[PDB]
Design an enzyme around this catalytic site. Structure first.
Site, PDB file in Angstrom:
ATOM      1  N   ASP A 102       0.865  -1.161   0.129  1.00 25.16           N
ATOM      2  CA  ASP A 102      -0.222  -0.035   0.119  1.00 25.16           C
ATOM      3  C   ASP A 102       0.760   1.056  -0.119  1.00 25.16           C
ATOM      4  O   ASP A 102       2.265   0.923  -0.067  1.00 25.16           O
ATOM      5  CB  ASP A 102      -1.085  -0.082   1.309  1.00 25.16           C
ATOM      6  CG  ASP A 102      -2.301   0.597   0.939  1.00 25.16           C
ATOM      7  OD1 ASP A 102      -2.151   2.132   0.903  1.00 25.16           O
ATOM      8  OD2 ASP A 102      -3.483   0.076   0.484  1.00 25.16           O
TER       9      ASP A 102
ATOM     10  N   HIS B   5      -3.470   4.611  -3.456  1.00 27.39           N
ATOM     11  CA  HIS B   5      -2.623   3.658  -2.581  1.00 27.39           C
ATOM     12  C   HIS B   5      -1.121   3.559  -3.119  1.00 27.39           C
ATOM     13  O   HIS B   5      -0.858   2.273  -3.103  1.00 27.39           O
ATOM     14  CB  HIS B   5      -3.421   2.595  -2.062  1.00 27.39           C
ATOM     15  CG  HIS B   5      -4.610   2.827  -1.339  1.00 27.39           C
ATOM     16  ND1 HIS B   5      -4.646   3.205   0.046  1.00 27.39           N
ATOM     17  CD2 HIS B   5      -5.799   3.121  -1.916  1.00 27.39           C
ATOM     18  CE1 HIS B   5      -5.961   3.439   0.157  1.00 27.39           C
ATOM     19  NE2 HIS B   5      -6.758   3.253  -0.715  1.00 27.39           N
TER      20      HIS B   5
ATOM     21  N   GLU C  23     -10.657   4.516  -4.165  1.00 27.17           N
ATOM     22  CA  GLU C  23     -10.144   5.660  -3.449  1.00 27.17           C
ATOM     23  C   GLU C  23      -9.409   6.455  -4.200  1.00 27.17           C
ATOM     24  O   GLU C  23      -8.110   7.163  -3.652  1.00 27.17           O
ATOM     25  CB  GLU C  23      -9.922   5.501  -1.892  1.00 27.17           C
ATOM     26  CG  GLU C  23     -10.855   4.792  -1.132  1.00 27.17           C
ATOM     27  CD  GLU C  23     -10.284   4.798   0.492  1.00 27.17           C
ATOM     28  OE1 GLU C  23      -9.086   4.514   0.466  1.00 27.17           O
ATOM     29  OE2 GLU C  23     -10.869   4.671   1.241  1.00 27.17           O
TER      30      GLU C  23
HETATM   31  C1  LIG Z   1     -11.385  -0.627  -0.285  1.00 27.51           C
HETATM   32  C2  LIG Z   1     -10.896   0.172   0.889  1.00 27.51           C
HETATM   33  N1  LIG Z   1      -9.961   1.042   0.896  1.00 27.51           N
HETATM   34  C3  LIG Z   1      -9.701   1.873   2.286  1.00 27.51           C
HETATM   35  C4  LIG Z   1      -8.642   0.904   2.957  1.00 27.51           C
HETATM   36  O1  LIG Z   1      -7.282   1.143   2.101  1.00 27.51           O
HETATM   37  C5  LIG Z   1      -8.736   1.155   4.442  1.00 27.51           C
HETATM   38  O2  LIG Z   1      -7.538   0.647   4.973  1.00 27.51           O
HETATM   39  C6  LIG Z   1      -9.868   0.697   4.848  1.00 27.51           C
HETATM   40  C7  LIG Z   1      -9.939   0.693   6.496  1.00 27.51           C
HETATM   41  O3  LIG Z   1     -11.276   0.439   6.995  1.00 27.51           O
HETATM   42  O4  LIG Z   1     -10.929   1.693   4.351  1.00 27.51           O
HETATM   43  C8  LIG Z   1     -11.125   1.634   2.879  1.00 27.51           C
HETATM   44  S1  LIG Z   1     -11.790   0.129   2.392  1.00 27.51           S
END
Ligand SMILES: CC1=N[C@@H]2[C@@H](O)[C@H](O)[C@@H](CO)O[C@@H]2S1
Ligand SMILES: *[C@@H]1O[C@H](CO)[C@@H](O[C@@H]2O[C@H](CO)[C@@H](O[C@@H]3O[C@H](CO)[C@@H](O)[C@H](O)[C@@H]3O)[C@H](O)[C@H]2NC(C)=O)[C@H](O)[C@H]1NC(C)=O
Ligand SMILES: *[C@@H]1O[C@H](CO)[C@@H](O[C@@H]2O[C@H](CO)[C@@H](O[C@@H]3O[C@H](CO)[C@@H](O)[C@H](O)[C@@H]3O)[C@H](O)[C@H]2NC(C)=O)[C@H](O)[C@H]1NC(C)=O
Ligand SMILES: *[C@@H]1O[C@H](CO)[C@@H](O[C@@H]2O[C@H](CO)[C@@H](O)[C@H](O)[C@H]2NC(C)=O)[C@H](O)[C@H]1NC(C)=O
Ligand SMILES: *[C@@H]1O[C@H](CO)[C@@H](O)[C@H](O)[C@H]1NC(C)=O
Ligand SMILES: *[C@@H]1O[C@H](CO)[C@@H](O)[C@H](O)[C@H]1NC(C)=O
Ligand SMILES: CC1=N[C@@H]2[C@@H](O)[C@H](O)[C@@H](CO)O[C@@H]2S1
Ligand SMILES: *[C@H]1O[C@H](CO)[C@@H](O)[C@H](O)[C@@H]1O
Ligand SMILES: *[C@H]1O[C@H](CO)[C@@H](O)[C@H](O)[C@@H]1O
Ligand SMILES: *[C@H]1O[C@H](CO)[C@@H](O)[C@H](O)[C@@H]1O
Ligand SMILES: *[C@H]1O[C@H](CO)[C@@H](O)[C@H](O)[C@@H]1O
Ligand SMILES: *[C@H]1O[C@H](CO)[C@@H](O)[C@H](O)[C@@H]1O
Ligand SMILES: *[C@H]1O[C@H](CO)[C@@H](O)[C@H](O)[C@@H]1O
Ligand SMILES: [Cl-]
Ligand SMILES: [Cl-]
Ligand SMILES: [Cl-]
Ligand SMILES: [Cl-]
Ligand SMILES: [Cl-]
Ligand SMILES: [Cl-]
Ligand SMILES: [Cl-]
Ligand SMILES: [Cl-]
Ligand SMILES: [Cl-]
Ligand SMILES: [Cl-]
Ligand SMILES: [Cl-]
Lengths: 73, 498, 497, 72
Positions: C120, C173, C244
């Site tokens: 990540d 990420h 995200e």
């Molecule tokens: C798919 C998702 N991406 C995120 C993760 O990177 C976080 O760690 C997590 C923590 O609960 O929340 C959302 S879920």
């Protein structure tokens, strides 16, 4: 100073005279231990932990870094 | 610079015993030209603290040798004499290696009290010679603390300056063990705890049961069990319990309801007093130095006893500062364990089964936090208390000086509904290290500002230390945050907290 | 009565490789007067399931010997082919023995997918030959997954009929590792994640950074990492992420700033689509059998791309049934991972430091659950998901017969912010076993009624079974509840659920 | 019976003729294994666990108990 002993001792003051090497083995000296040798026994456990761990601080205090600022054209 | 060779320790009196309030203070000094680390302590117990501080200063030099990074002057002592955690072995058994493991972490963080909640309604794990039959209600023959098991726990604790303060919870939380001695000394133990039909409820948690406060023989057995245990536990303090007295449970006892019939002026407050005025004598009877602890409920629940001796230490767990104010105003010595800051078990939902409150396939209300969406998930004391929550607790806030000096310290309880050997350590640690500093040196910097942000790297490092020392403490952040200090702060502003 | 001597196993197809959809069914028959335990299965993978069933049936006769208590006829197979948990080794390192321990747990509960969230933003722990420098953003030299480590993981799984599905989350990420290969390929990695100043936020959680979608060379480096990783993971499925995307982060890329400037009608939807049009063909082209998995965000977030190929399986974690229904209705295959039911990491508060939201000395509003008093305590997905909450999840509720066919299974993720060797097993287990049953044989009895109350003793016993097999699963109740069945039920009425 | 395998199998049906002892060690017999011995190996692991655990059901199903009623 890297170490950050927990709990934060009430009063702690560090110098600037440089590091102090341990000369091989730290030797306990007391003529005032409980009859059942509690201080001696606690020392032996601490020293054997110190020497087996050769602790390297895993997290340390610092100022916050200079993060790059959000640009505006 | 000079090289260190010796540790010199002078204890002023080698006679002080490990008991409430013993002088735990010490001084530690390393000088530039001195080849000696100098440690002075009022007692052996202060010297023990110096050693656990000292090991956290002696690190690798990067070349297979050891250093203290700089010379140093330490003067140090505990703000409070009662700094503790509470282990629940009644709900689930915890083995000796795992009890030893908690005492180890306790030592490195300078907690001096293992409050041990030995039994509960669910089980009776401790061997009693006078009544060998009590352990018939242990979870199995392997899940029992022999007499010798207790001696070794006590000694292992003594070696690390930790007092073990036992709890047999009476008169509530009593079914298992007791009822093998005399089935009539317990009432409602075969009731339905009945939180599905709240008016008929006999307990807060399933496995209901309480001691018949009237029955003749209740107090003989209680007295015999207490006296035997008192003998194997060398602390002067003892915890009698006295929490969560459920009035409906007594309805299953002829005695207590007959006692209510005899005189219908009699209320439940009277019933509590009866226990107080019969049980406390039996407990005070044991020893001259015997002190008692009990949960606040006895003197401050809805159905409290009219007059509880101001002699008995009160452990407060409800309403935070409010209830601490009430008790401290009325002349009670108080142990802080408020559930809203310090209950370590919280935040793992409910453990009660056949529970339809989870069976909701959609958010019933997006604007308010509710059971499965934003709310407790069946943990009454939810949410989970993070190390910050714990560290931020100012438990003498808005109190007077006369009040504040009635606070003797704090205890973080870990209730054991969802705790056995597998997670006891990750539930206790490192969060109990946060409490440990709070009641050792406080959560304030030199200027009185709350120093939680400074605690970050200290506790994060301490977690890795605990792991190095055998104590299976939970990770608190991505490891990226240890190596990049404050990179995981929410505010760059290091004054965000107040 | 007649003693058992043999276990006969007849497997119809010995060729079927461990891959998506392979037949996992079996029969297991122990007859009153037969000396043979008879197991039939369409593949070896069905045969393994039979053995893990069988070990839960052979018990002590209490006199030194072993029995099966009664004759038995079983016929068994999974309702869904995709039965998984997700491990996050990006936030914190999990060692091989703890990874093996999880695979053991999966084995015994018949889960068959380990979705491995490898990296990540916070670390790149996996060795890549083509760019040796990526592991410079590993937490320590001893916290690296060598290629031989990966081989032993794939193989340990294979031996237990478990598929390992790697995830390299892109283009969000992304900081650690990538930025060692080429600083330009990631953007806003030096930015302040800025949730203290919300209008400037560059990420939802600390350690910001995203691949530079426009920077031409990004696709060279990802293509080379993806290819080398595709070669060492044999499953036809590969997870390429897509969760995200933060618009604010690209304001640190000159490349994206220019791209928006050169045609001002462009939106982040287009930017997301740019990634989809350039990344996906590279991913999809590894082999003919390759199926991709992506987080639903790419096709369903506020900054979704316009057209995500219906080739790509969507993993759903938000808004429960609403996003599952939405997705299935558009024709996507969906892995259910709804965070309101299946996120194993919720309920441990927040991990971000210097947080004043904890600093509240009295309940500011007793009339409603709030941050420190009955509310979430800093964990965005609170509360903690109990085994019952997981088991009770009817993820096909209100779906048509055709929507429901697009559900391929589920995955309980365990994000790693506050998870490493110490607690990984107690956070997965035994809750993962509740999902295990849900996607294997469902949460309903023969009459179609929810049997959560029946699951109680089974999962309480299985937890102890896990512990006896070396899997450090968490206690669920006081042991009294084990020894007194239903004593701990809230409702005495056994049909309450 | 005391055992209660997880997941609950899609269809499972028990008889009532009593226990069947495992005599010695269950020998695996098959002609239909992969070339990499997947089945043989899985049986060795399964069988060695079975004999090492000599498992005793820790929690078993029974109807909820009869509690004494709240006295009227
Ligand atoms: C798919 C998702 N991406 C995120 C993760 O990177 C976080 O760690 C997590 C923590 O609960 O929340 C959302 S879920
Ligand atoms: C369980 O047992 C207790 C007593 O053993 C019951 O509590 C008692 O309830 C009665 C009424 O139901 C109370 O009597 C009341 O007296 C006053 C007189 O001023 C008045 O309010 C009414 O006339 C009423 O009759 C009594 O005070 C109360 N006792 C105590 C100690 O609180 C209880 O009802 C039983 N619960 C059951 C059977 O469900
Ligand atoms: C980060 O970068 C983006 C992309 O450059 C910035 O948003 C972009 O700039 C403005 C937002 O004010 C938008 O264009 C404007 O549209 C209005 C009419 O709608 C018009 O009056 C203006 O003359 C101008 O053309 C544009 O849509 C927008 N692009 C997006 C959202 O893709 C953004 O503001 C930057 N953020 C920060 C915090 O600096
Ligand atoms: C799935 O959810 C999305 C919401 O993101 C819905 O898409 C929107 O639908 C309406 C009608 O086309 C538009 O006004 C929005 O702009 C759409 N979003 C876009 C194009 O990104 C979609 O309708 C949902 N599908 C359902 C409920 O079946
Ligand atoms: C499913 O559809 C019915 C239609 O009446 C509704 O009652 C139910 O609440 C819907 N969705 C959910 C999540 O329950
Ligand atoms: C403390 O008292 C002040 C007034 O003296 C009041 O404003 C404040 O709300 C109190 N705070 C707490 C936490 O009780
Ligand atoms: C004192 C208290 N008595 C009860 C305990 O028996 C439980 O274990 C705890 C659960 O969190 O709740 C209250 S606190
Ligand atoms: C704390 O200090 C150490 C050196 O002692 C650094 O390595 C670390 O990054 C932090 O600045
Ligand atoms: C501290 O961290 C910031 C954010 O990565 C950098 O920009 C800075 O150079 C230093 O490494
Ligand atoms: C501190 O340093 C960072 C990282 O180099 C800069 O980007 C910033 O402008 C400040 O000078
Ligand atoms: C389930 O059944 C077992 C025997 O198979 C009992 O011993 C146990 O108490 C439970 O009722
Ligand atoms: C089931 O459990 C109840 C509660 O203890 C008893 O009342 C009953 O006899 C049976 O043992
Ligand atoms: C059901 O049966 C039990 C016997 O154990 C009784 O004690 C109870 O009152 C109920 O009738
Ligand atoms: Cl004394
Ligand atoms: Cl009276
Ligand atoms: Cl709620
Ligand atoms: Cl609740
Ligand atoms: Cl194939
Ligand atoms: Cl079937
Ligand atoms: Cl375009
Ligand atoms: Cl579409
Ligand atoms: Cl909230
Ligand atoms: Cl939040
Ligand atoms: Cl059925």
């Amino acid at each position: 100073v890297g170490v950050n002993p927990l709990p934060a001792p009430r009063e702690i003051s560090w110098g600037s005279s440089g590091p102090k090497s341990i000369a091989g083995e730290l030797q306990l000296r007391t003529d005032s231990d409980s009859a059942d040798g509690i201080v001696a026994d606690a020392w032996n456990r601490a020293w054997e932990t110190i020497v087996a761990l050769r602790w390297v601080p895993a997290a340390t205090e610092a100022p916050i870094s200079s993060f790059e600022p959000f640009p505006t054209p | 610079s000079n090289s260190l060779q010796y540790v010199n320790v002078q204890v002023k009196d080698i006679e002080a015993d490990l008991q409430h309030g013993v002088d735990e203070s010490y001084t530690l000094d390393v000088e530039e030209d001195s080849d000696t680390i100098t440690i002075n302590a009022e007692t052996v117990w202060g010297a023990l603290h110096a050693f656990t501080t000292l090991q956290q200063l002696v690190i690798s030099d990067g070349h297979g040798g050891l250093i203290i990074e700089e010379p140093v002057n330490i003067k140090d002592s505990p703000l409070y004499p009662y700094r503790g955690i509470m282990l629940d072995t009644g709900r689930n058994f915890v083995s000796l290696p795992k009890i030893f493991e908690q005492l180890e972490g306790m030592s490195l963080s300078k907690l001096n009290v293992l409050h041990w909640h030995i039994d509960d309604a669910q089980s009776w794990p401790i061997w009693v010679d006078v009544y060998p039959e009590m352990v018939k209600d242990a979870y199995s023959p392997h899940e029992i603390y022999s007499r010798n098991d207790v001696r070794n726990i006590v000694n292992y604790a003594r070696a690390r300056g930790i007092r073990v303060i036992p709890e047999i919870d009476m008169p509530s939380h009593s079914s298992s063990g007791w009822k093998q001695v005399d089935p009539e000394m317990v009432t409602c133990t075969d009731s339905w705890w009945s939180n599905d039909d709240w008016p008929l409820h006999t307990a807060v948690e399933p496995n209901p049961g309480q001691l018949d406060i009237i029955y003749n023989k209740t107090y003989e057995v209680v007295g015999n069990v207490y006296k035997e245990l008192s003998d194997i536990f060398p602390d002067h303090w003892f915890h009698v319990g006295g929490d969560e007295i459920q009035p409906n449970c007594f309805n299953f006892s002829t005695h207590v309801t007959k006692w209510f019939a005899e005189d219908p002026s009699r209320t439940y407050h009277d019933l509590a007093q009866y226990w107080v005025d019969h049980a406390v004598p039996i407990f005070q009877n044991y020893s001259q130095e015997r002190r008692l602890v009990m949960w606040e409920d006895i003197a401050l629940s809805a159905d409290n006893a009219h007059d509880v001796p101001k002699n008995i230490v009160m452990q407060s767990w409800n309403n935070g500062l409010e209830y601490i104010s009430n008790l401290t105003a009325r002349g009670y010595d108080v142990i802080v364990s408020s559930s809203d800051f310090l209950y370590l078990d919280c935040g793992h939902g409910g453990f009660v089964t056949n529970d339809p409150r989870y069976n909701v396939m959609a958010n019933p209300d997006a604007n308010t936090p509710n059971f499965n969406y934003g709310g407790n998930g069946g943990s009454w004391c939810a949410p989970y208390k993070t190390w910050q929550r714990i560290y931020d607790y100012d438990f003498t806030l808005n109190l007077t000086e006369t009040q504040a000096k009635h606070i003797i310290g704090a205890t973080a309880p870990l209730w054991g509904e969802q705790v056995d050997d597998i997670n006891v350590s990750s539930m206790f640690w490192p969060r109990a290290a946060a409490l440990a500093e709070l009641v050792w040196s406080g959560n304030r910097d030199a200027n009185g500002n709350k120093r939680t942000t400074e605690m970050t790297q200290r506790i994060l490092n301490f977690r890795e230390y605990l792991v190095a020392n055998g104590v299976q403490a939970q990770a608190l952040v991505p490891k990226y945050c240890l190596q990049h200090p404050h990179a995981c702060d929410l505010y760059r502003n290091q004054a965000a907290i107040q």
